DNA sequence: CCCCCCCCCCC
DNA sequence: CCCCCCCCCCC
DNA sequence: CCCCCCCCCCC
DNA sequence: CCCCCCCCCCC
DNA sequence: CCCCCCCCCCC
């Protein structure tokens, strides 16, 4: 039954371990058996578009949860307020979009509350008919199935009205969530489900009521609940439409239907402080335009075989990249995303031999200096949202036989040829807080062993304020990967950053409820396993004249002393429990020395 | 040449999705100014089904299958396409005649059209009233002819 | 000196009595001597665009303040939370804009706090150089002077960049006010000036942190402080521009200047959760376009004299209206606003005799049935933001000699000819909460003695939920103006409304901290002076079987019983102090019988 | 494609009527420096003399339609390229079709100023109609895959 | 995971 | 035509 | 020339 | 207010 | 109809 498929999917999804192991970084899996009871390191079952799993993942945390219960940390009535990792990404070539990756403690508080009240979500989701977003790309509810549902919903209509909400996630008033769930006139008399949910959301973003912490699956689930209650209001008024998150497709024939729909939709938006993006409002008349047909794209390679020469494969792949970039320019949404999966699947399906793949992607044409890996790398650097897809593509063809040393040399050569523009780019994103672009550049330098772009001085200039946690981690990794440099300068930079960050806070505020919680955990976890040698930390702190004590040297660099400071130590106790059990949140590679090339 | 790389060895699900994408593609072609593209949908689907040499029971499965999760059926999509333009009534009924000869059961088609009409009864009654007041003869004719036939 | 003119203006403005007498309804006066120490009723010195002064004004309250001190009501640390009057107005022919007229108690709390900390505002305003909005159209800082300042600020630039903030007032995060004033990294540790200011603002909108309560002068002053601190940040980075509220005019010559400005402006907007309206972004190249020249408009009437016939005056005025409507269509902002003042000033300056004015505006052409007052009335009904300008124009020409009975008959005839469309309009705005349009129609019916449009049944359908206070007052006035109808049905409607409104609240919430505070004050003030006869209220409440008691009949209609209910009675005590002293907030006319035709 | 790496935007520039209005005495300017035209007998001066002899001592334009003209024009344009490379710019040129890859508007403006300066020095005129910036995702209208 | 056909939307 | 203000729309 | 894959840009 | 020239921007 | 390749335009 339809109901029973929905129920299976939602009992899979609404599990705390699922919700952190794939939810935190917004990962999707296509089969329940992918959710193995072991730590996954060498492969990736998941599909994600934000963060590189081989460096940043929740596998160790999920393994910890699988055997030990952290319910006890999450019984205090008032949820602890914490600062998230602010991580700004491109919306397009011009605009920006803000992610907020919550403190893991606040994430887990919200996570257990949502799984404890999962029926609040599941009854509405299963009763809902208009949402194609209430599957969250999980299991087998992929893009063609959601388009099938949308097509069914658009029956009978000679016209389509398209409506969008402007800046929906990022300006959503969080106290309007209980209005949508329970009725606005019942907000005026807490202790209910929706009020507590709002409180935990604001705790995830430091009691900020402006917007929802975007970039994770719990936020998507809460937003979907909000929007399915919007859908319930519109359905009680007897309207039929398709919604993907905030993209409303209204089928209609007569203008009175359209006008009555617009009045009702305007009314609910005004009641809940929602704003329509009037730029995106458009009526499409039949015959309907469809710019997102992907048939030509996935059938680019029909007439090429493994009997074709490696040169024809190279030129065909190059033409493919140009063709999909042009398709995306023309309005074919997701065409650039399609380049990497379909190249990989064509290489697998045409059954090209490993040594032929090595020749295809490692060949440098002598006259033209052209190499097709370099073209694909430059394409990925054109949009930092493509970082994960590019690195997954590299992983796949490296498995297919493309040598990792050859890839490292190609990326090194690319970076040397473009070093000046790349340094100007790094400076641009550092001044303007373009977090994902800087992250992409540093992650490529970490992955492909680029040690020539930035010297010691620029690397230490990376460790400063207005740098996101992930970039701080990647720069610190770049610095530790170079054995020539000595650790005192990094210790000084990190200490300065920690003190300056704590200076923005009440002196009774715990460190792990503050900004840079993830970098701090990285540091304390490294120090706990002597990559950050305890002797040289002692030397640095002697140089700084810190007073010793019962726990140690009374510095921001000493977790033994830090874990006990602050009035509320709940986040500190949670992260100390993680540190003692050797739960890592940042993967240091197979051999603990920060190499990700396999 | 939409259907060059599909064969009778392809699964019925791929045939369903390929036909759906075909309909969307020709509707977009007609929107872009390709005159007669929507007319082309029915003859070339029928000729592809004949030429790919798909078996009668496979045709029955292709056009009678209701996907349980999505409630999608490809005959219902083609029927709704035909109701989008009443000049398509004859082409739709000829297409139904052809695939019914190809093996698609007439009782299954009747149930599919009945279900479509029940789900859209309110809008269809408003449509009937519209064409009755405004003398839209072919639209009313198409609706009543579907009710007679199915 | 420049400083000393600024100082004079700001010591005039930052006075509590000024800030309520002209600030509450956003009124401007051109001379300090207009701020008389008496109640103004028959004339209006002020200039306002929102609410009709002859019905809604603060003159009685200001007279009360002038002799008695209400500081004592405003010493409790935690400000009482209240609901404002929600009053939605057209933004244009399509979009809407929300006003929130605060509870007078919360207004006065904010008012005294701001005047007590006026130096916080005045130092920044006087030090500011980029704002042409920091004069609030007061005294002699009118439109040409602000344009003079803007012109000076735009010197040296071959290009202008225009930037706007989208939905600035209505989506402003109120906790970002202390960020702008003090620095965002100092929000994390209250008791300071900016935090208390934020708290009083949210108290004005029922502890809602989404947006600023728009439609009054205190909101404009707070928004100007916010924006002048934005200007201080941009000036420290050595940029020069003109700002009107959120309209940024950046003068520049080279594209590097423009790009650096855009990066800095984007950075501050991202820091303070401000969103640029990317639709309004445009660069203008010299030679510069100027679509707002008003020279032809104010010189339409140069070649007409009082020796011209009344027919030529009629036709000239008609052509004038068409010409300014076309000017506004072409992008001449404020051209339609210009119609009424310049017609009035032309009639005064051409020195047309009173009987000639009567003939001009009262003449009905027999063949064409055309009357120029009816055309101007229909123009005003085309945009409800024109209500005040139309009624001021009528007041002026009525003073010039145009008979009020003739105007009443003309408006009556108009309303009879268009009764069907007008009833459909009334229903439209009632279903869709178009508050200002409904207000305009009911205010015309009140002013011009229209008693034929709506019978008793529709008038009682006016008294229901989702109707703003001002429309509720105007409908109740329409009902009391008709002596044929008896008062029991209105008493039943009003009682139902009061009970239903209190049902949305905690049972310990005081009535005058709730929605419909202004309607409730209207009712209680009428009952206190026996327009709402006490005998017939007793009869109604006997019919409803209310239990009597120490104060009276224990109903929502009895202020004696109502004033003592609720845990916090501060708002009730303040409004009871107003009621006892016969301070009215709604003018009932010269002879207390609700006639405004003079 | 290799030359256009690293760029989020492309600037397209063309020279108007390049072959047919090329001042032939500007060839020694491009090859040797304009301030060295004022004191012949050198390579570039003799080359200019033979070109004008091919078109009846006409100094307006280059005799178009043969490979020697293409070689001389390519020498001229590669010296233009040497001037732009010494100022540390990277672009693709086909004859007179300049494809400038860039990311920030300051790069584009500095390139435009330098290019304008050299064009003014050598009596070269930009076809302002063909000037356009393309933003990524880039348009490509010349795919021949369906055709072949 | 298992054992042809895939691959895209949003915030 | 008579005795200021005019003057244009359509088919 | 020799022995699959080609084929187009400019002036 | 008092005693020529005015009149418009925003939210 | 018979025995590969079809299939569209208009009024």
Numbering used by the authors:
A (entry chain A), C (entry chain E): 0 to 188, 191 to 599
B (entry chain F): 300 to 449
D (entry chain C): 150 to 188, 191 to 299
Question: Paper's wording?
Answer:
The structure of Ll-AbiK was determined by single-particle cryo-EM at 2.3 Å resolution. In line with D3 symmetry of the hexamer, the two trimers are rotated relative to each other by 60° around a central three-fold axis of the trimer. Similarly, in the cryo-EM reconstruction two separate fragments of the DNA product can be seen—three nucleotides of the 5′ portion of the DNA, including the terminal nucleotide that is covalently attached to the protein, and eight nucleotides of the 3′ fragment that are accommodated within the channel. This implies that the region connecting these fragments is mobile or the DNA length could vary among individual molecules. In the cryo-EM structure of Ll-AbiK a clearly defined density of a 3′ nucleotide connected to the rest of the DNA is visible at the active site. The position of this nucleotide corresponds to the pre-translocation product state in which the last residue of the DNA occupies the position of the incoming nucleotide in substrate state. However, the position of the 3′ terminal nucleotide of the pre-translocation state captured in the Ll-AbiK-DNA structure is identical to the position of the incoming nucleotide in RNA/DNA complexes of the maturase and HIV-1 RT, reflecting the conservation of active site architecture.
Abortive infection (Abi) is a bacterial antiphage defense strategy involving suicide of the infected cell. Both proteins adopt a bilobal structure with an RT-like domain that comprises palm and fingers subdomains and a unique helical domain.
